[PDB]
Amino acid sequence: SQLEHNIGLSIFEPVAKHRANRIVCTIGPSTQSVEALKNLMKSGMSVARMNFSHGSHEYHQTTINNVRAAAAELGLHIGIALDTKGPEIRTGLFGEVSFAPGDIVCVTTDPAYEKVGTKEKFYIDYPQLTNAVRPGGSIYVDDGVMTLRVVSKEDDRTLKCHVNNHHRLTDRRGINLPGCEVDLPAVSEKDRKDLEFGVAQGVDMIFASFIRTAEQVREVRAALGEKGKDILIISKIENHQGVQNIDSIIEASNGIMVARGDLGVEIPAEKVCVAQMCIISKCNVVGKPVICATQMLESMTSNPRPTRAEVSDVANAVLNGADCVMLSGETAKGKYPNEVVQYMARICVEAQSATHDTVMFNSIKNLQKIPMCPEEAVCSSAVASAFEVQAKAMLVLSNTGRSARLISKYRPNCPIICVTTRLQTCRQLNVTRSVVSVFYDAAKSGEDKDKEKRVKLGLDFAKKEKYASTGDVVVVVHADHSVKGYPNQTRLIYLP
Amino acid sequence: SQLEHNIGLSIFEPVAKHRANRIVCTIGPSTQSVEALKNLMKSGMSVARMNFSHGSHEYHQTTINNVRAAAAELGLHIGIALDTKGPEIRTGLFKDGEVSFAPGDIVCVTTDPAYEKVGTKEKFYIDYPQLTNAVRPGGSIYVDDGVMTLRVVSKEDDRTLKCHVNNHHRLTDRRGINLPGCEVDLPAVSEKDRKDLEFGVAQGVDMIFASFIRTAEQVREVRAALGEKGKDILIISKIENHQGVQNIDSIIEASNGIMVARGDLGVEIPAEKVCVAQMCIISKCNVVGKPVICATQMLESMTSNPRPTRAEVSDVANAVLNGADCVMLSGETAKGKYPNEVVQYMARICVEAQSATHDTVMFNSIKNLQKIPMCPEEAVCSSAVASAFEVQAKAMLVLSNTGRSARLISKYRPNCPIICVTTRLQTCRQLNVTRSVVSVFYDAAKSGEDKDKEKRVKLGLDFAKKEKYASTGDVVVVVHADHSVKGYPNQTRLIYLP
Amino acid sequence: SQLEHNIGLSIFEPVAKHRANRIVCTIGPSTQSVEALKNLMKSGMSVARMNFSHGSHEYHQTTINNVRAAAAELGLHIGIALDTKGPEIRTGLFGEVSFAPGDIVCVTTDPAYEKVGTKEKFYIDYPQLTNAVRPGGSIYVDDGVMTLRVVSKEDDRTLKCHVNNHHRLTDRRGINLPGCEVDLPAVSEKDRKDLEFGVAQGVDMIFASFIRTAEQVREVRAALGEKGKDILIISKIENHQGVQNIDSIIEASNGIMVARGDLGVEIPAEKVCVAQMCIISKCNVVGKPVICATQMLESMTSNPRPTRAEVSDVANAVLNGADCVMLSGETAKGKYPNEVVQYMARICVEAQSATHDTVMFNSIKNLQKIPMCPEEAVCSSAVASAFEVQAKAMLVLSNTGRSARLISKYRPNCPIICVTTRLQTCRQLNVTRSVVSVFYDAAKSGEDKDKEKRVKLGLDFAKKEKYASTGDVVVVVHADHSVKGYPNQTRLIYLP
Amino acid sequence: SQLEHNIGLSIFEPVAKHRANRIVCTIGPSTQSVEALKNLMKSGMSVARMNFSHGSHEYHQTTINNVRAAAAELGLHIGIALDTKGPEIRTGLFKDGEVSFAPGDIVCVTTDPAYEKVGTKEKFYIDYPQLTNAVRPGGSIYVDDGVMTLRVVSKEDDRTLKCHVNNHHRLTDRRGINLPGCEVDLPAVSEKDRKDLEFGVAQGVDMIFASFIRTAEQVREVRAALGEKGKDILIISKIENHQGVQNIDSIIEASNGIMVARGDLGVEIPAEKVCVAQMCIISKCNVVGKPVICATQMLESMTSNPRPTRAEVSDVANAVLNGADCVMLSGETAKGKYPNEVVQYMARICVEAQSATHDTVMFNSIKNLQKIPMCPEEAVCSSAVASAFEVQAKAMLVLSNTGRSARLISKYRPNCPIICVTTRLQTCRQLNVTRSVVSVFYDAAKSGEDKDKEKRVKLGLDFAKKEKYASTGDVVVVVHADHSVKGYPNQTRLIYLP
């Protein structure tokens, strides 16, 4: 039981030597230089997030170039993620006002009130407004620091609203419709240009904002088009629809972000913790990477030490089952970008060492539909045989990354060394728990039909990184001599 | 499995009507007035914490009087907790009242009290005579809440360590010292604690939060300090350093309860190791059935902001999921801008984590670790909770004079309120640290002996009905003694509310 | 796990002192005298079975009188069971023949062939014959020592049959239709007279032969009528229909007999073991007594020692979960009636001591629909609290026996002392595992509204029978001072 | 749970096509002819047992030759087992060749060999010199297969016990003696066993069923007796008395397998305690992965009747449910009227009990009791069986030269056939005592080295197809070594049948 595992926990035992979970950092002024990036990588960054809410194509190009130069200097494969600005609902032009508690205000969707507007009749660029918010429900303004409650519908396009608290305003502020189905495009026009940038520049994954339906995930894929077919889509769940539609969004995506900042505006703050637990477990169950985001070490934007709550939050995201934990402002524009990543890495390792070896393995395995595909039977059994011999490492050949993700899904307690023939697989596997990638250049080194070259490369990597030594058993997953497309074989071998 | 339970969780379902977990609030200038305290109680405060690190007896008397007046007007039973300063290690003074250190700086620290008032950048005093025994070369000394770190380089003599400063810091008079990973032979109770404890006993406080408990032997010395007049006051031991964590079993045995004092603990042990200690300490309390409080920075940002961070919301939820009876607020309510709002948030998060808890998993896990044979009252209490799950009881009702039997039922983590009918007002107040329990006072002076339990049972069932725990025709599980057994409950009944 | 429980088993540990399972014996010439019966009771008999297949009303009256006198001498409550002859299918008159392997024969249902018949055209008194057995299936003759396979339908009422083996014949022999729905009456005319005898003489239960449907169980109850409303009906499952309809037969009956002798003729012999396991567990799950019958110690009809298979069979019926095990020929007409019952009792105790304490409790509890009725919550929790304190006995007040059966359903490891106000409850509880009955005569002793007299009677019985001593905890189940109709209260008390 | 599994059982469902359990038959005048033996093999005999309690070497040679000829004509691999007489305790002779005892009779028994040929009602010989040490006053001596019982009353001298006869019995020359609950210091092997063992080794028998094993030390003495030429012959130890049961762990360690010899055991220990020993011994073999045979009277009534009793059917089913690899027939096939029919019945009951078994419960239970870390081949074998369950494999295929790896897979109780491709005919024959296994012989003399395993794998997959275990496009789990590892299998593959 969890309870019996807990009472056996000790703060005096050595922690795991090899960190399983993965850290995503947002880049910004704190961290854009090649030097800052290198330190960030030494500190524990596996994925660089470009927040496309702000900055131009030129700014983000500097980010891209600088990441790639930092990584080449350190001999690392660092994934690069494009986080889209996303379709959004905003007020029209004004140039300011002030709305102290108790006021009564009118919001219009007629586009002749866009450039005009005042304390009494201002624009909202969402043209379906008087559908979504029926009388009695709420309109959130500016990440919901200000709440408005609609009484009724004035003309076809205006609603009447009782203001609830203090606040100032300015043009083009952010609007939320909490608990309301929102019928926006998956992809804004700015998003189209940003995605096609991302394709052209070869980003590894897209963090797709405000994903509400499976259909919107497919819109994002079609926009990536043919040249972008192998770019991961990580759907950001940000409102009640996302949560409602989670099953089918998962099916459509390569992975999920629990985008708690935005989600905690759209749904009551205390319900985010139910959503988190639910979503992370649903992803664990299908073997798709999941990322926990937002304010995880927030106070380290300004302090050299995190709060007790913040350490807890990181530990528990790991215990919940998240592959990755993310940093936003902490690394983008904080005083202590390196220290915050180092803390995050230590907390990960600690939560990982407190995790019961085999509980996830069994739980996940018991929820799988029988019969399995052969490769999944091979990968789950390989993880079982890793526990059985206390393997210090596993080794998988994977070109797309599929097989690595499939092993990671069963949650072994050792590193998964993935020898791959694709640089982009090395980068994309950065969002998958446990996996460590080694590139085999098949053009340079030859075909390796019998797998011996890649196996040797992987076993030598295990020695060099001090995962294992001579005479240690390693579990090795790839195809036999004739099967193509997936691994059908496991071997236990002793390092020479 | 947890994993299967998670995938079935819903944000769309109604949440539990009755909050199981309890909230301890620290009182300060934000919240000390009668009016502020009524608001706090309405928002969900069950225990008022006084931090005796600060403030005179007069300040705290006002807190006590105000809490009592507020609770009287509302008809609530509210616990009052006295949190001791506890013994301390501190530097001496510095010349000019301050001195600045940079990395690489070598400084001698001495336990020779000659140097107490004349600290410099070269040499300063630390008031712990066992210093040169406690930290060897290589070991660390933490200054000013760990903000500054010293590596001990060598022992110069039997009272002097040569140290290396690890980082930039400005140091003022009499800063706190922490000796990570060292035993520490301070008394259980300082001279000041005695005057505060005596004050506590005189004013009739319900519990001590005893600072810096490292051994069971110190818990007993706190009990001895409270004397005969304080024999009934709960001792909740604060676990604050590596020793406390290492001796947790015997400290639990000796205490009435535990507080995981995360702020201090995370200065003594690496910050990341606090989550491991929390999970362990909380579970070990659950297993023996003693209340445990989780403390420190749980909603810290709401000291200034009307909304908590995402980290802070999950912290509260996860403390409840770990199994904590209580969650605590410190500066959030002592000194903060939004003391009502933060208690309201804490209460909402509590209810949400409770509703996301698998109903029977704790019950089973806790039951499976008990030694067999149980004493009869524990077999009675655990089997009552089992019966409650089996009929989906909306409430349980237990007669308890000391609180023992209420705490014993709560140990098994029912998913419904536990209505306790008690003959002691102090039990009413002290059950505020116990999950699920709701107290009703039976006045035996007014109403008579109640040997056959009928009046107390009627009072409880009326309470359940009035307070909307249950309605006519609902099954309620009722635990007390039969007509002859004395000293503990040997009987369980299932009863339809009349 | 079962496997881990097994490897811990020891043949050197003391066995349980108090036998939980119950033994039914068939009476006959070996065992009809008052003396023989007394020894049989001393040996371990809890229920006397009168086999109404043979013997007259007068013969069985002697059995009844003699049982009641033996029991009164020993101060015991012995249940008396009437096992009905049952509707049956038989051939017509002949006066004999012989059918060595390979022969070809014709069977008719025209009743003008009843008194006549020979090697070539003999009667079968089941008039729906050419419906049930379609060409290709089989007709069993004389407990299926002889099998016949039908080729086709000659005239409306005749079938043509290929004989399969040697055998002789005589008038009025037993016929089975293996795998065929058989549309007979639940109650034969002989059965009506026998049941009304049973009512008049006050038998405790009816072992109802050849029960195929719930509806037939109700026919048996209606025949018992008003004066017999409280007589247990134990339905004997004897063919594939019984097995198919088991759920609804269980619902209708007070209990079940797995009538393996008859069942092993109707269905393939090896399938009886699947049926046994299934039926016994279904009864355990609803808390209704079940009896395993037929050939359990067969060879002890003639030998003073059982075979290894026979000892195994008894042990495993107990391990399967059966309340009772039965003896037929072994006690009715064997040389060693006392020894066979003594063996059976020792095997029961051994299997009981090898049973894991709490596995049944949990298994049964986990299959119950939540919410439970209050009395069932009380009874299951009382058994849980018995395990928790290692109670040496439980004590229940029960007038109908309902509450005793409900405690027994949760399978405690100690005796269940039942204080009852009805002599017939004492007798009927003989088919329920663990239960030991004490009669409280309320007319003689008074009302006992506060339960103290019956509780004292039960606690004194616990002392006298050496279940418990002064200072032992006992779990005591009855109503509180105001509730009527069921127990709502449990207490743990120390024997004074 | 078992209980939930039971309630879902159906008599109407199709049963498994391939029998997992194996059947050992004793050969006698009913079954010795080539023709009788072909019929027996077609009916399901996998191992032919010779009972060396009776019969000359010539009789048994005929059995061996006939078994081999029958199996050759059918193309079957059939194990041959030699069951030793074993050492014995017996009475001496009586005057007039007999003597009758009644209850209450006092009789002296002596270990003085002077009395060996002149037993009377007053005094007779028992050929066990340690008698007066082994049974104290109060203890029992069992005569003539326990049919007669003596209570030892007193010790008259160092070679004479005064006894009380418990029951009526007529006693003839040289009846068997059993000393219930006493250690018994007979040799592992009698002088006769040596000539039988030597005969066994010369004729190339596949296994010994070694009688009356009480200690691991005796198992080793049987192995030493078989010498170098018999180093490869399986020793299946017969557990026959309390010692055997008490030392089962070390006897298991020393043996290749166990037979629960219920007939003899139930003379030594109370008859009811045999079910407890059976369940324990069978499970302990399952846990270490050594074959276990259940024996004695399993279908006894079919010695004379064409149909078994209800007890006998459940006995076979329950031995299979306990976990026995094999079930045995003795007189049923040696001396009986219906030797084919009884084997056919045994086989049908086996298949029914197998189909009623929960597929994965054994796998899990067995796996959870293994020490971690496993050796790599056991991790390979148990994980292969896991993969078989996960894809609902219709067969597994394993390369094994000694049988070790086949037995290691069988240990984990897959629900499908385990096809073993072996390079030794003797392994083919010896795998007949192992659940699920079906052997194919690869002739390395004819067909070559097969270093890369491809020929042996093809032979196995062809076998699976020909024998209707699986068809084209079915997944099959395949276990052997990779191209470099020697001595054990380090590799598992899932392969679609071509």
Ligand SMILES: O=P(O)(O)OC[C@H]1O[C@@](CO)(OP(=O)(O)O)[C@@H](O)[C@@H]1O
């Ligand atoms: O790229 P994924 O989809 O993970 O499949 C990789 C697997 O396919 C195989 C066989 O096709 O790759 P490879 O051909 O490169 O040797 C396996 O060896 C390898 O484990």
Ligand SMILES: O=P(O)(O)OC[C@H]1O[C@@](CO)(OP(=O)(O)O)[C@@H](O)[C@@H]1O
């Ligand atoms: O006869 P059953 O149906 O078991 O009900 C008996 C129960 O009812 C009660 C209460 O009605 O009987 P009683 O009135 O005889 O005292 C309980 O005390 C007793 O446990």
Ligand SMILES: O=P(O)(O)OC[C@H]1O[C@@](CO)(OP(=O)(O)O)[C@@H](O)[C@@H]1O
């Ligand atoms: O005879 P056992 O002990 O089963 O060992 C057989 C195993 O060893 C190996 C390797 O040595 O045999 P082989 O050399 O005959 O190919 C594996 O292929 C095979 O599975």
